[PDB]
């Protein structure tokens, strides 16, 4: 019943599906919640600040000063709920204090230091950062 048909039905005939593929293997990450920091020592009196910036894939702005280190994670907004300071005084490291400071739209790391020290910044994955503060021994 009709004239010529195919008026709104061209005639694409399917023959099954391609949907079965399980896109996934791993969970997502390891410390994958939201932006956070950690402090530890490694080797010999080195102050290691670990940084977990979830949703930041690139490199922060690290400012190396003798007084302190300033990392700025541009366009990474740290919740004030995650901003914590680690006093870490007398850990026998060149780090005097670790401070995760939320900035307006950025995240700022304030890693207070003193004297001569050495900064080795590491990225373990896009989002997981690490700052190894060695004492520059003279």
Short mmCIF file of C-alpha atoms in Angstrom, two decimals:
data_model
loop_
_atom_site.label_atom_id
_atom_site.label_comp_id
_atom_site.label_asym_id
_atom_site.label_seq_id
_atom_site.Cartn_x
_atom_site.Cartn_y
_atom_site.Cartn_z
CA UNK A 1 0.00 0.00 0.00
CA UNK A 2 1.68 3.14 -1.20
CA UNK A 3 3.22 4.83 -4.15
CA UNK A 4 6.96 4.44 -4.41
CA UNK A 5 7.83 4.32 -0.64
CA UNK A 6 11.38 5.32 0.59
CA UNK A 7 9.92 8.70 1.37
CA UNK A 8 11.65 8.85 4.76
CA UNK A 9 13.16 5.37 4.76
CA UNK A 10 16.13 5.07 2.41
CA UNK A 11 16.94 1.49 3.23
CA UNK A 12 19.81 1.16 5.61
CA UNK A 13 19.61 -2.39 6.79
CA UNK A 14 21.60 -3.29 9.93
CA UNK A 15 23.01 -6.78 10.47
CA UNK A 16 24.00 -6.94 14.10
CA UNK A 17 25.89 -4.82 16.51
CA UNK A 18 29.47 -3.74 17.18
CA UNK A 19 28.63 -3.02 20.76
CA UNK A 20 30.27 -5.52 23.07
CA UNK A 21 33.64 -3.88 23.51
CA UNK A 22 34.47 -3.22 27.13
CA UNK A 23 36.21 0.09 27.22
CA UNK A 24 38.12 -0.24 30.42
CA UNK A 25 40.80 -2.22 32.08
CA UNK A 26 42.13 -0.36 35.04
CA UNK A 27 40.13 1.54 37.62
CA UNK A 28 41.44 5.07 36.95
CA UNK A 29 44.37 5.86 39.16
CA UNK A 30 45.80 5.35 42.60
CA UNK A 31 45.42 8.58 44.53
CA UNK A 32 42.73 9.72 42.26
CA UNK A 33 40.32 11.81 44.23
CA UNK A 34 41.14 15.45 44.11
CA UNK A 35 44.18 17.72 44.60
CA UNK A 36 46.30 16.76 47.59
CA UNK A 37 49.89 16.78 48.87
CA UNK A 38 52.27 14.57 50.89
CA UNK A 39 55.66 14.87 52.61
CA UNK A 40 58.28 12.20 53.06
CA UNK A 41 62.03 11.80 53.15
CA UNK A 42 64.15 9.80 50.76
CA UNK A 43 67.79 8.94 50.50
CA UNK A 44 69.48 11.23 52.91
CA UNK A 45 67.64 14.21 54.44
CA UNK A 46 65.82 15.08 51.29
CA UNK A 47 62.38 16.54 51.65
CA UNK A 48 60.00 15.00 49.19
CA UNK A 49 56.72 16.61 48.58
CA UNK A 50 54.34 14.54 46.66
CA UNK A 51 51.58 16.25 44.84
CA UNK A 52 48.43 14.84 43.42
CA UNK A 53 46.76 17.26 41.05
CA UNK A 54 43.81 15.43 39.61
CA UNK A 55 42.79 17.00 36.39
CA UNK A 56 46.02 18.76 35.69
CA UNK A 57 47.82 17.38 32.74
CA UNK A 58 50.86 19.42 32.06
CA UNK A 59 53.51 21.15 34.08
CA UNK A 60 53.05 23.64 36.91
CA UNK A 61 54.83 26.90 37.35
CA UNK A 62 57.57 26.21 39.77
CA UNK A 63 59.38 29.14 41.22
CA UNK A 64 62.62 28.24 42.92
CA UNK A 65 63.68 30.60 45.63
CA UNK A 66 65.90 30.01 48.63
CA UNK A 67 63.16 31.21 50.93
CA UNK A 68 60.48 28.94 49.47
CA UNK A 69 59.22 27.18 46.38
CA UNK A 70 56.09 28.38 44.67
CA UNK A 71 54.30 26.06 42.42
CA UNK A 72 51.35 27.34 40.58
CA UNK A 73 49.04 24.99 38.87
CA UNK A 74 47.42 27.17 36.33
CA UNK A 75 43.77 26.57 35.84
CA UNK A 76 43.71 24.03 38.61
CA UNK A 77 41.38 25.18 41.25
CA UNK A 78 42.20 23.74 44.66
CA UNK A 79 39.33 23.38 47.07
CA UNK A 80 40.03 24.92 50.46
CA UNK A 81 38.92 21.56 51.87
CA UNK A 82 42.12 20.04 50.53
CA UNK A 83 44.48 22.81 51.36
CA UNK A 84 46.63 21.73 54.24
CA UNK A 85 49.92 22.75 55.65
CA UNK A 86 52.47 20.36 56.92
CA UNK A 87 54.52 21.95 59.66
CA UNK A 88 57.37 19.41 59.17
CA UNK A 89 59.78 21.35 61.26
CA UNK A 90 62.76 19.39 62.64
CA UNK A 91 62.37 16.53 60.12
CA UNK A 92 66.01 17.33 59.24
CA UNK A 93 65.20 18.28 55.73
CA UNK A 94 65.74 21.59 53.78
CA UNK A 95 61.98 21.96 53.87
CA UNK A 96 60.80 24.14 56.64
CA UNK A 97 57.08 23.88 55.94
CA UNK A 98 54.81 22.51 53.22
CA UNK A 99 51.75 24.50 52.44
CA UNK A 100 49.11 23.65 49.93
CA UNK A 101 47.45 26.93 49.28
CA UNK A 102 44.40 27.39 47.23
CA UNK A 103 44.58 30.32 44.96
CA UNK A 104 41.65 31.90 43.10
CA UNK A 105 41.53 29.58 40.10
CA UNK A 106 44.95 28.06 40.56
CA UNK A 107 46.62 25.90 43.10
CA UNK A 108 49.72 27.21 44.72
CA UNK A 109 52.37 25.23 46.46
CA UNK A 110 54.34 26.90 48.99
CA UNK A 111 57.21 24.83 50.08
CA UNK A 112 59.25 26.75 52.51
CA UNK A 113 62.96 26.12 52.42
CA UNK A 114 66.18 27.58 53.82
CA UNK A 115 69.86 27.76 52.94
CA UNK A 116 71.10 25.92 49.93
CA UNK A 117 68.96 23.20 48.62
CA UNK A 118 68.32 21.36 45.33
CA UNK A 119 64.95 20.87 43.60
CA UNK A 120 64.17 17.85 41.54
CA UNK A 121 60.65 17.99 40.23
CA UNK A 122 59.15 14.81 38.90
CA UNK A 123 55.97 13.89 37.15
CA UNK A 124 54.93 10.27 37.76
CA UNK A 125 51.90 10.61 35.55
CA UNK A 126 49.84 13.55 34.28
CA UNK A 127 48.48 14.65 37.59
CA UNK A 128 50.95 13.06 39.95
CA UNK A 129 53.82 15.29 40.77
CA UNK A 130 56.69 15.09 43.15
CA UNK A 131 59.24 17.60 44.42
CA UNK A 132 62.47 16.28 45.81
CA UNK A 133 64.18 18.92 47.90
CA UNK A 134 67.76 17.80 48.56
CA UNK A 135 70.09 19.73 50.86
CA UNK A 136 72.83 21.41 48.85
CA UNK A 137 75.69 20.44 50.87
CA UNK A 138 78.71 22.61 50.97
#
